[PDB]
Structures are given as C-alpha cells and as structure tokens.
Design a protein around this ligand. Sequence first.
Ligand SMILES: [Mg+2]
Ligand SMILES: [Mg+2]
Lengths: 51, 292, 154, 160, 142, 161, 147, 141, 116, 165, 163, 58
Amino acid sequence: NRPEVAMHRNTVGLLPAHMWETDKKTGKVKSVKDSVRDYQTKTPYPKWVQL
Amino acid sequence: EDGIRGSEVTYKIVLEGFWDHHVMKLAEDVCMFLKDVGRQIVEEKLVAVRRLLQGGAVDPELLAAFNCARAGPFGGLDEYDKEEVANFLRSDLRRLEEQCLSVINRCNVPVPGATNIYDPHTSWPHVEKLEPWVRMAEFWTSSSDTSFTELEMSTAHYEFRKFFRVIICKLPFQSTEFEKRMYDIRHWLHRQTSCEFHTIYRRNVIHDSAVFPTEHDPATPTTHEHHRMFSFALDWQSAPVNRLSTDTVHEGESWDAVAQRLGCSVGELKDANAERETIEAGVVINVPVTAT
Amino acid sequence: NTFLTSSVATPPISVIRTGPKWWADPERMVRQKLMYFTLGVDQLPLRRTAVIQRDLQRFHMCKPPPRVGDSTGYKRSRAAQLNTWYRRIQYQEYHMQHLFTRHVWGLLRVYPGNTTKIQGKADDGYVGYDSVPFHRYNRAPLPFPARELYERRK
Amino acid sequence: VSTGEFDHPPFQFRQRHTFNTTPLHDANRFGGRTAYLREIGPVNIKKQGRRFKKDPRTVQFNVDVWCAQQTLRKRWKQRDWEVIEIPFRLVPREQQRVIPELYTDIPQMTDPARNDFSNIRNKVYDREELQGVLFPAAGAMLYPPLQRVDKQAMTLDKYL
Amino acid sequence: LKIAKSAFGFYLARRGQRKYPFLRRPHIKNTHSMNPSAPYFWSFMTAKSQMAFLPEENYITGDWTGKFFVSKRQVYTLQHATSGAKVRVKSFPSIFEFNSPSRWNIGKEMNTLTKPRMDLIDEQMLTKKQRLDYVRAGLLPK
Amino acid sequence: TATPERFSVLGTTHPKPKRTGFGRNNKMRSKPSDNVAWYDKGPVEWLPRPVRLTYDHLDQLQQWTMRATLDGRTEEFNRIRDLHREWSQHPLMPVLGDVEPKFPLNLFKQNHRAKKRFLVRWHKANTPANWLWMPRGPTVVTPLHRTNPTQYPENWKQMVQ
Amino acid sequence: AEVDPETGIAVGRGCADGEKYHFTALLRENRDHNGIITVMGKPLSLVLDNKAWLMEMVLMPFDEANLDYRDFDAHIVSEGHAMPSIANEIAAFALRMAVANALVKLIPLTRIPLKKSGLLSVDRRRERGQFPGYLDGKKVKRRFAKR
Amino acid sequence: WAKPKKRPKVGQGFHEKAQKWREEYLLDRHRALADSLRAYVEFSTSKRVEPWDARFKPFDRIEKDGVYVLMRYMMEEKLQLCNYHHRPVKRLFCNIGLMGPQITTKARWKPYRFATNPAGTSKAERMYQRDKTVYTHGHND
Amino acid sequence: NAERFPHEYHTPTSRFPPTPSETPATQDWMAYTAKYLDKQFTISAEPAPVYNVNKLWPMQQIPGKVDQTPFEEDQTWLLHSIPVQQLEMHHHEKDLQDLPFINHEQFPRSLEWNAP
Amino acid sequence: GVHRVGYTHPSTLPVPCAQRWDLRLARARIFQEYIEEKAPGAWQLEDERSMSPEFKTFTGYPMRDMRPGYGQNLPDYIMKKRLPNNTHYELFARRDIPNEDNAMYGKYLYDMTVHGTSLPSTYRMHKDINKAQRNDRKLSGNRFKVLCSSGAKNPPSGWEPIPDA
Amino acid sequence: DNLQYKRYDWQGWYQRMLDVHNRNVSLRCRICDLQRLDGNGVQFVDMQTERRLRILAQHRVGMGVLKLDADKYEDQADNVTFGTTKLSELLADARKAQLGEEYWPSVELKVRKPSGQSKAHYSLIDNERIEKRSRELYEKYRDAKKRSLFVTPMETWLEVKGM
Amino acid sequence: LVRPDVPEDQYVDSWYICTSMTHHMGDYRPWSASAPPNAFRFRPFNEFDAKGREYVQY
RNA sequence: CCAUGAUAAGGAUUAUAAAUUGAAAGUGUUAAUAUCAUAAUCAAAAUUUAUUAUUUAUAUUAAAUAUGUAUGUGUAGAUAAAAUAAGAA
Ligand SMILES: [Mg+2]
Ligand SMILES: [Mg+2]
C-alpha cells in the first residue's frame, strides 16, 4: 500500500527478506542476492496463454 | 400573432466588415434594397389574396383533408360542407391581408429626413446590432537571444476586429423569389464585406403512429446495462424499428381469425387486401398499417 | 491562537507607517477596543490614536501648507516636535496592544506564536514545533512533544 | 454575499510570518487544506520541488474544487427533507399542474390567485399532512397530528 | 545557443532563462526519470493504471531486420532478464546496455533504470573555462 | 545481479562538498541577529513578535470575564487595572530639538540593507522601559484613574456611610 | 426633476475604477417613514458586512442634503464586475455616488449642497493595466544586474 | 547572437566508463530500493507518537476525562491496530461520531513531520536523526 | 489479492470518493438503536413511505447500487481520499482551442452570435 | 449517508405511477446516453465560478467539470470529445503554407496561362542575373555542380566547347 | 464566400468546410400546437402527455418550446431527417401517458423530516419498558460500583462482542 | 480639443497613423443633427437620461 | 560557410484641464560582395549559461511522465523594486 489510504495495513510478510542480506547491528540491507539464476516459475506468461 | 411580432418566415442576414462604418453603410444599402423588393413581392401577394377573398371554388382535395378524421370533437365522423371549409380558408386569407398590409405600411414609412432603420415599427426590414469580434494579440517586439526580461518589457498589443450588422426581415408567407433576391445580394456586396443567411421557416412534420407506435412498456424491462459506453453501437438499432407489413395466412385461419391475430377490424383487413375476395391457407396478405 | 510559527519582528515605526492599510484599519482597531472594553478598562491611547489617524486619513490627499523661509527654523522644529509627539502617542498604543494581548492570552490558555513572551507563564520565549529543533534564542534543545504552559483540565 | 476567500494568493517574493502578512501555504488558509499544496523548507530549485504546487492555474483550480465542496456541503446541511415520488392523484392542489424542469422556464409562483407567490420548487411539505398518503398500510396514524396556534385566542402577547 | 551540442545549436536561441507554460517545455529532458521512491515505486513515472497494456514498444510490430537500441519507454519484462539477449537503450554518450539482469528491474520502464545525468563527468568534453566553472560548483577536483 | 564486492567507477567520482553556511547563496553564518527577542526587558519581548487577536479570543474573553465576575474573583481584574494604569498615562510633549535620528545619506546607496539595519537597531535599543517621555512610576499623579482596589465598585459596601 | 411620474422613482449612477464598480440607485420616497436601503436584493447591513465606515458613506448624501434617510427607499443595482463581497472602501465610494446622483434627480435643489461637498464629483482612477513585463503583472520591474 | 562554438569530441574510453558507471549505479540502486522498502514497511508496521496536539481542546483535558475517556473505553483497540498513524487515527475519530463535527474544526493535530516520529520520541532533534540513506520520503524511521 | 490493496488498483473507469461497504442497521437512528444499542426496542425502523424516496436528489442513481450522499461535515470531505489536480488539465471540448492564451478560432464570428 | 438506492415498481404501489428512474431509462434510449455506473453520488459539485451570478465570470453553463484527476487518457473523455476533422486545425493545414498563392493554383499552370511560360522564383532569378553579371568580368572562381553528372562527363559526340580566354 | 475564397482551387474545400461547420439544423415546435385533436378524436398531447414530454426531453425544452438541434451528419438534409425522426420517437414515447395512469410521471414533493413536535415523542418511545428496565440497571450499577471506580455503559446495558 | 467637437461616430481610429479621421471625408454634422429637433441635452427623448430610460421601461 | 540595409531595451524638468508614467539612433532570423561540406523538431533526449520573484510546519503523488533535496539565531559582502485606486510630505 502507498501512504495515502491503507499504509498502516502493510505487513512484514510483504517483504521478500529471503532475497537480501542484512546487517545484524544496523538492521539494514547490505547486499541483494541474485534473482535470476535459481528463479523457478510455472508461469512465465499467464496461465491462459499458449504460444 | 398580430403586427410586428408574427410571421411565416424569418430571414436574418448577418453582414460583416473590417471597419464599423463599412458595415453600418452596407446595412443601409441592403436594407433599402430589401425594402423595395419586399414591397413589390408582398404587394403582388396582396393582390392575389384580394382576388381569392373576392371568390373562388374549393379543391375536392382540401375538402377531403377537412373530412379525414375517424372522429371529430363532437364524437362522430364530421361532415364539413364545402361552405364551412371555404369559410376557414377565407378567415386565414383575411389574416394574411392584415399581415401583408402591415409589412407594406412599414415599407412606406422611412422617408429621407425621417429614416430610422433600427426600430422595427418604423421600417421593414429592420436592423439589429451585433457585438463585434475582437481578438487581442500579445507579443514580443524584441528579437533577443540573450534576455527574457528584455523580451517581456517589449510587448505589443494589437487587435484583430470584425464588425457586424444584422438585417431582419419577417414575411407572412414564403416566396422562393424573395429568397432568390436575398441569396443573390452576396454578389453586389460592398468591398471586403461578407454575409451569412439565417433562415427560420415553418414546415409540416408528420408523426406516424404507424412507424412510431405508442405501445406498453415491454414485459421485461431494460436495465442500466443496455446503456454502457458502446452500447449505442452494439445493443441498439436506430429508430424506427421495422414492423412487417406482410403476413402469411395459416391453414385453419379465416378472415376474422386473421384479423384477430393481427389486431384489426375485419373491414380494415379487407380494405388493405382489396384484391382478394377469399383467403386460402399459405397465401400472402397485406397487414393494415394500424394493426396493433 | 492558530498562527503558531516563528515570525519576523518589525520596528514599531514601520508598523505605524502603514496607516489606514493596517495599523489604523478600522476593522482591526475596533476589535482592539473590544478587548479593552471587555476587560473593563478605558481605551484612552486607542482613542488618541484613532483621533490622530482619522484626521490623517481625511486630509491625506492635500498638499502641505506653504512654507516661508526662516533663519530661526522655528516652524520646521515645531512641525517636527508635533510629529514626534504623535509618533509617541502611537508607540504607547502599539505597546498596549502587544501587552494586553499577551496577558489575555495567558488567561485564555492560549499558546502564542513561536518565540513569544507571556509574562507569568513563559518568561523566555515560548516555543513548540519549530522548523528548527532548538529554541532559537536560548540555543537550548526543545522537548517532544511541544511544551505545555497550562495545567490539563479544560 | 459571502465574505470568505475564493481566490488563491498570487506567487511573489516569499511571504513570511509578520504583522499584516502570513506565508502563502500557511495552515490557516482554506481551512488547512493548503497542506496539499505545500513544499516545505528552503526548497533547492534546481534539484527539488513539485511543479504543480507553484503553478497559478493548477493551484487555483484545486482551490476552486475545495470551495465548491464547501458550498455543496452547506447546501446539503441546509436540507430538512427528502424528495418522495408521489402519484399525481394524491398530491396537493398546487402540484396538480405542469411544473417545468429546472432552468427551463421563468421561476414559478405556487398560487398567484390564492395570494401565495413563492417558488414551487422550494416549497416543502410536512410529513404529517401527507401521512394518509405516504403510509396507507399502517392503520393508526404513525405521527400524531400537528397542533396549531389559535391566532384569535387571547394569550400573553395580546396583553390579556 | 553558445555551444552547439547538436545541429540545433545553430538554429535555436536560449532567450536567457525564460519561462514556459506549465509542463510544456519545448524539449523533453527527463532528468528526474530515475528518482528513487520506495513507497511510490509503482506509481512514479509509470503507468497510471496497472490494468493498462504494455506500450507499443515492447512488441515487434512489423517485419524487421533488427534494431540497434530499443526505446526507453519499453518496460523491463521477466524475459529481458531470463532470455539473455542484448538489451540496449540510447543514452549519452552512446548506449546503455543491461548486461547484469535482475528481477528488481521488472515492471518498470528503462527510463527509470538509466541515470540521465551521471555523477561522472568527462574532463575531455569540457573547455578549460567550463572545467573552471565545474570546479567552482565543487564538482571537479582542483 | 548479486551486489558486487567492489564498485569500480561508482565511488570513484569527486564528493560534493558540504555547505559551510545558510540563507542566501549558502554564505550566511549562524550568529545572533536583529530579529532576536530580548526577554529581560519588561512584560513584552522586544521587538515584539506579531500577534493576532481574533473574535474567537474575544468570545473566550467574554466568557472568562463573566465566569470570573460570578465567582467573585476580583484579583485578576485588579492586576489588569494596574497594568493599564501604569502604561496608559499620557505621553509628554517633547522639547524642541528632540526628534528620532534618521539614517545619514551619502553612506550607502538607497537600496542598501544598512538603512533597515539602522532603524531596527535603534528601536531595539529603546525599549519601552527606556521610554522617558511616558511618565510611569509611583511618583506619578494619575488624575484620570482610580488609585487602588478600595476605590472600585466591588468594594462599594465600604463606601457606604 | 427627472422622475417616473407613476412609480415616483429616480435613477442615478456611481463609478469607481472605471470598470470594477458601476452602480445604479433607484430612489423613491417612503411616506410611512420606514425607509430602507437595499443592494442587489440584500439589506445594506449585510452587503457591506456591518462595517460602519463603509455604510456611513452611503448615509452622507442624505446628511449633506439635510434630509431624513427614513423618508426614502433605495435599491442599488450592480452593473459592473460582480464579486461575492463588495465590502471595501472603493465600492462604497461608488455607492455613495450613485445614491447622491439619484437624490439630485429627485430633489433638484438638493444638488447645490451635494455638489459643494464633492459627492457628485467623479474621480478617475484605475489599477494599472496588467502587463507581462512586470513581475507582479502591474507595478514591479524585474531584477537588474550590472553586466 | 554569436555563431555557436563547436563542441569538443566525446572522450576516449568514456563510453566504457559511462557504461560501467550506469551499470553499477543501477546495481547499487537495487539495494537502495530493497533497503528503503524494508524501511517503509517497518515504519508502517511500527507505532507512532500521538497525532493530536494536546495544547488545544478537546485534548488538553485531563487524561481521566472527556475525549480520553471516549478513547480508553470505546476506541482503544482500533487506535492501537493502526499504530497511531495520523491518517487512520483521524479517520477513526471521524467514524466514532461521538465527537462529531469537531475533529477537523475545533481540534488541532500535530504537523506532518512531527506526527511521524516513532513512539517514545523525547527530543525534537529526532526528526533529523532518521536515516538519510533510504528513499522513503520521510516515511522511514 | 487485489482487493487487499485499496489504493493500488484503480482502473480507469473508477471514481472518487470511494464508497464504503454498506452496514445493516445504519439508515436511521431507530433502526440503529434497535439493532445495536437497545435490543428490545419495538420500532425496528422509522416509518417507510410506500413510495420511492430519492436520497441523492436531483441526481438520479442506478437502483440497487450502494451509494453515498454529499457529505455535510467538513471533516468528511477533508479526510476522504479525494486527490488534488496534479498534471495539466483537460476539457473535452476546450482542448481543441489549445490553452487559454492560444485560443484557437476557426471563424471570426461574434462571441454573441446566435444559431438560428 | 451510505444507503442502497431503491426503486419501487409501479405494480407494487397503492396507485400505479411512472417512476422517475424508468423515465430516465426511456430518455437514455431516445438520445442514446451512456449511463456511468460508477458515478459517485457524493460528488455533485456545480462549478461555482461560472454558475453563480456572484462572480464576474458567470456564463450560466458549467464550463468545466470539477473533477481533479480527469484526463484526455480516459475512455469516458474519449467518448465525449470533439474530433479534429474539419476544425480550425484543418483550415491551418490547408491555408497556411510557404507561398500563399500555391494554395490557390498550380504556379506552372498560372504562369503558362498568364505569361507564356514558367517563371523562376524571384530568388532564383536573382542568382541567375548575378551569375550573368559576374561571369562577364572574372571567370573561374566557379564550379560545375549538376543534378546528374553523366551529361558533362560523357558529353554527346558533337559538343566541342568553345575555348576561352 | 464572396471575397477571397470565392474563386480558385481553395474555393471548394473552404466551401465544404463552411457547410460542415453549419450542419446544425434547429427543429422547433410549441407544445401548444401539439395539443389538438388527433385524427381519432383523442387529444394528441394532453396534460399528462406534456408532463412526460418535458421529463423525457430535459433541457431540450424551454419557454414551452421543444427544440432539437440536429448536428449528427455533415449535410443539412440528413440532419432534418435525423431531427424529424428523433422528434417523432420522443413524441411516440411521451404519448404513452394516454395508455393509463401507470405511465403518468410521478410528482416530486419535498417532504420535510418529521417536525420538532413529532420528534418530541422519540424520548417517550417504549416508556414503560424503559423505566422498569432502568431500575434493574440501577441495581446492576450499584453492584458494579462496589468493585470498580468507574462504571461504563458497557458493563450495564451496552453489548460489545469481544472476539 | 484636438479634433472638431462632433458626435464621435463620425470618427475612425486610423490604421497605421496615430490620429483619427472622418469616415466621410471632411464633411461634418453638428451635434444638433444627431438628436430630434430641439432635444434637451441632445437626447433621443427629453424625459430621462439613458439609465432613466432603461429602468422606466423595465 | 564569407556573403550591406530594417522594428528592441534603456525614467531626469512643456503640471492639471474637457488629457497617457515609456523614448529613433537599434536588440539572432528581412533586399545586389557568393565559390568547403544535405546538418532542423513529427515526441519521451546530455546542466556552466551575466540578465531568474518558488510552495517555510494542523491534514501532502488518481490519468500524457513530471523533479531526493540545503532544518540550522530572517543571520556576510554586495545587490533589487515602487510615488499611476490608493493611503509616504
Ligand atoms: Mg541590426
Ligand atoms: Mg529535413
């Protein structure tokens, strides 16, 4: 949610924490893991598209 | 309505010059022209009317037009005799003489010391003013690549202008001849001056209860959903709807059974189909247009 | 008080020089008078001011009287003396207005604009929620939330 | 004939909080709406700003929407009534006519012959006089009838 | 203009610092197009509705020989990352390539992935005067 | 992807300098300024900050004044009466030769700051506690006003014979 | 006296700022002694926002002419630029003028006091025309720097 | 109007430098983005200082009376669910209706940037002590 | 999951202010009182005129659609999700005459010209 | 209030009568009218500026609609919008062109009818006359530039240019 | 055009452009002249038919004159066709008011809320039950106020569902 | 006076010249010829001024 | 790309009555000197340029995409504008 209406409804469950690397002391994101190599999806295109 | 306030046809000629006095003097010119031509036409019409007032027959056709009603105000088919009809005709012609005379008499008011073409009581046609078109141009007079300030400080104002007079002629009848003179004034207009022609005339329209019938609302109603964007292109036909004028007679059927199925009087169904005396099964029949 | 933010102070004389536009604008002067009257105190300085200024306004489009040259300079000095009198009559008023307004605000549990004194309550200027985190003139750090001058019940 | 402000002040040299002057987007204008228009701080022109917030035409449009809301709001707080759609028969004698739609004809007088001249448009009816019509099902009247004042009765104001 | 960086240097006048009507400046130079926002990430310099289709420029419209760079309003799609094909964009001096593919790009337009004004400056495209003026502003060391 | 250990060309560039100062052209120092209030002189800070008295405040004032009258609190009325008596006395006609100083011409150009800077610094130095042309003190005879609490109407019972 | 013989009404006009304020006063005698002044259908109090220093300007012509304002009914009509509030001194100047001209058409001799007190006199003043050269659009020239 | 001087040529090996610099500016921006999303959500999720300005009414009133009673017994749960973020707090007060028209009109609320402070904030300096490495638009702690 | 994020998916047919989901007893004080406050309250709703009551008026609305009435309270306007104008502004007819300063005119007809 | 809009079908009333909404659907069929389903009931706002006689800007009609977000983008805007065909844009397209007479007739046509021949533009004529004048004194500050070079490079079998000095 | 665009290659397209700028055909009729006996002896437009006509064509009526401006087609001829059609289609629908009362458009009354006088009884609604109950509630309150300093309505008659 | 004192309808603001000219070259009709014979303050009708005429009519 | 012409800006003493506080001395684009070269917008683009009035603390990104940065005692030096429906002697 953007800040205008529902901002307080954001959850910590939205963050993809497993995607990045954090510093213990600061609590800050130092680095980001690579997204593409291990990325598995059953849906490159939407499910209803057969080319 | 009587006097100045009523007419069969109105023409408004909207004259436009680049200079105000141009358009003023053009309006005097054109005005005096239409005064003369108008008086000539309306005088001609007036003599025709005075002759028709003096006497004349009645069309079989005009009489037939008074007598087409299934029921008149007194609740039965009404018989107008030729006398009565001639009397209606005569009354209208009376009114037309008053109107003609009114136009002519205003044509004869505006003499040389006394001419005022602005008031409609004093002249025919008269003239109305119309607020001028004025566009103001704002622009830089400087040519400077270096400073915005110096450009703004040089700013000129000039105006384009266009000036308008309107000539109004109301006539009690419609004459293609007057209309012709009037359209043709565009050929002798003053220098660098143009014009528009507004016409407002009276015209008979005809409402057919046959083509546009008045029926109960449908047994199922229509929602807001038949009104989406592009519903105009997708969910609707153009009015009027096509209702069939031709029906085939089923096997067991009879004149009155067919009339009952089509919603007519049997008389009607026989009149529309007059060629046929008897109707066999599988024959094509004309559906009387009034059928419900 | 709705206008809370830090402000810029103008010297009394320039405030008075606004004449009809602000200092003597009828509308403003009347509600000053209302404040005094309600407190049950004559408004003499306001009335002096209103007199002076009323007349200023009446003749404001006329040219000044013709001056004859004098070695004495008595005329010039008498005009000056009169003028600074009037200036002072109005300083006194301007002072009264700021004075009583601050006092009345103290009674109404009103918080003044930033950096403003209210004699019994905030001696050093009162501040809360400034654009700058310290008190501007003390150079002391401001507490969160905004400091309260009055006990809680309303 | 309102005294309120309908125009946003023109952009100029920065206004500051003074006797006789307040900042442009100060919280006291337009009932604190100016929040929506405000770029706080010593704005660094080159790098920062939100353009629409300094634009005269855009800003004024926003303010005009806000004024419109104010008026609408107050016109609706001003209603004590609902529009009910009542069949032609059951309606009072004054509405048995034809009533041109809004802005179609001349503003129309309710009953010139009975000495009432007022907009039929704005005439409001009492829920109690229309009771028999609006709640026929109910049997016993739901609202008790209005009690009216005798203007011929000797009461305190007639000095008796 | 003072210096001609293109042909138009010859044809155009600057007119000092001149004001144009709101959101019409003759030349669209989007300096802000990469301007980080976490909360506004999906609404800023992107499509006003998420139900809009991707632009013209994500599709091969006609019979092509091939292209040199794709347009900058093209939006970065999972295939841009995965397929491992050349993705170029025209920026200055020459062209920017997306070489190191990330899913974090996905769903934004390449406008937004390409910094228009770099913190990096060539000293060799600068006159000695211009270099002086860049030292005054505290950009170049000297 | 996969955030690298080193950035070759990223941190390479010259760092933008911190600004040394504030206000116009970032060259202004942080120091005490003319706009600064003095809280050590009289009830009003000097120069006085802008103050807006509103009809709202006038109504709150009325209600306070009323509630005070009905609880028979005479004290704040008396403080107010005192304040008023002190500062409202009629200022004395100045002696010939006495005028406020203007700013000398042929010092700075007419559009220069110095002009205002002078005015402010003058009025800053003359605080209302320094106004000698208005006669405040215990010494002062005040014909227009009542002297103490005992002379005001809520004392009326002692005025009776 | 130029007066409508039937309605007994006289008509004056005020101006200020050449455009902004054009008013027209319809002035008629009230025999019941309850007179009232009304502007664009609203009572004078409301229209001028109860500000006295505006309304007394509209009182002045009845004074100068040595008349009792209560013997007269007036309605003023705004023919200029309309605005939600006309309470301000310039508009009031125009009002006063309209009323005074009407009064003069109604009681001819009353013209001599009025003219001497400069009520009927028209000042011609205007805000400067807008013009893009100036910053504020009216009076303020843009910044200058020595080369 | 002087003839425009010609621009010097681009540079040698500056095409490589520009490629690399933009490349890793983008790679950096990924973590700057990741981190600022983390911050934004951490802020939305965590508690804030009370949004209302206690210096005015109906808020000045002793915490055992008036609005505070209305809050402790009827609104408390909701006020805590939304973590005293100033927008939902003000809306809840509108919907409780037992104050009714006052919320916008008589009541005063803290300014935007102050209302955004984390609960527990003691000194004003806190506004300036939040992290500048993160792109939340002041919506970060 | 789209309904979970209210401000995120705005189709370009959607309009502000958003309408809140309905609530059962809310339409008048008697109904509300009966359902929530005092539950043995005999009158379950205030007397409902058998004819149609048009609550938005003059505006006609689609029957059966949950809707809102113009707000009476200032706060209701101020704290709702109504946006401010931000980009350049458009009008379906007036766009053809570009800006107010470029006021395009095909023919120089009097601005007061009247169609016959 | 938040309510359900409601409709009483005339068969159910204790007097049949024609419901205003039903009439509205009639009017929508007749003049084919888009019924915006999502039109918020709360948003009725007249345009104060143009619709109130109190402002100098009073036209009597709602000049703009007061909706902040509204943009040329939206399908709703597209549906009520004046197409550029036969507006002033077309008039500019045709009448404003570099040599205004080329709007009224083919130059060659005109020239050939009026003069016996095509005539060069004034500019061209200037360069022509000048060449003739300055070819008469100096020679060979010149160059030979044509459209098609073959005619000079291989000239016809004849063509022996007169030697010059 | 008689001036400039009179005679050359541009005379054609300018002419056509004026003609298309002028396509509008205004169609008027007074509602007065619609109230006349029809061929069947029934009045063609009566009071109810007129009310229905007015509500159907909204801003298209003024001063008791129905006015349709037909702009749809580039040529005036086609606009009189179009305009005439819409007119008869609108009359066809307005005329439904002669089929019976169900088609007579409703009257819109502004009906006041209940008055002050009515609203006064709101405080007596269920008077007996409420007094009898408030005595029990007073017991509940007296008891609850031995335990705790402040007794909320939510401990007495108000229900608030916990989970 | 810069130009003869005559009803201004006789004057035209010149194009390209800062000056007015007469739309009938050099002929001049006096004020008396605009109004009716012996018209008080040359006036269409003597009873009222322009505004007086308007509101009487209304 | 050498290849003449022409319109800007720039207050300093013809004043009050029935009356204007903007000027000729020339600011890219315009008509007789030619004898290196296709450089021109129809989108989405690269800051060094004297010549520019920005929103400063109750509520803050919805339609063409639209600016992330500088809180620092209203604080150096040096500069800008105005006597015109306003109020200055
Ligand atoms: Mg030159
Ligand atoms: Mg080309």
